[PDB]
């Protein structure tokens, strides 16, 4: 999903210009989870 754009995004925030793929995965989840939560929270209003 975002492994390549989220990768250039981890750089712009202070990570290596080459983040560990391992970690970029954990991050994509956190985001996919995040969006969802927001998505559910938003409809609710």
């Amino acid at each position: 999903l975002f492994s390549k754009e989220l990768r250039c995004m981890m750089y712009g925030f202070g990570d290596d210009q080459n983040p560990y793929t391992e970690s970029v995965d954990i991050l994509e989840d956190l985001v996919i989870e995040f969006i969802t939560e927001m998505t559910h929270k938003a409809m609710s209003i």
Binding site: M9, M10, Y11, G12, G14, S23, I32, I35, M43
Partner: protein
């Protein structure tokens, strides 16, 4: 200043999630169509969300002494503090 600082801000400034996948992920919950604004809007909040984790993740990384690239242990030990600080859902 240095070319890396310049090249790190350029990557920052332009980085963004693909509209395509934000639309697909959002509509897989709403069950309905969503405006481009909702997609654009959702991408800032998501970028910001990422920003906050990396910073926490980085701060963890260094207090533990260690150095980037951020490790999965940095990502998770960061998520926790941001919940304990009550800063992320």
């Amino acid at each position: 200043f240095s070319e890396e600082q310049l090249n790190r801000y350029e990557m920052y400034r332009r980085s963004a999630f693909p509209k395509a996948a934000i639309k697909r992920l959002i509509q897989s919950i709403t069950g309905t169509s969503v405006s481009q604004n909702v997609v654009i809007a959702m991408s800032g909040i998501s970028k910001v969300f990422v920003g906050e984790v990396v910073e926490e993740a980085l701060d963890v990384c260094e207090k533990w002494g260690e150095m980037p690239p951020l490790q999965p242990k940095h990502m998770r030990e960061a998520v926790r503090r941001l919940k304990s600080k009550g800063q992320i859902p």
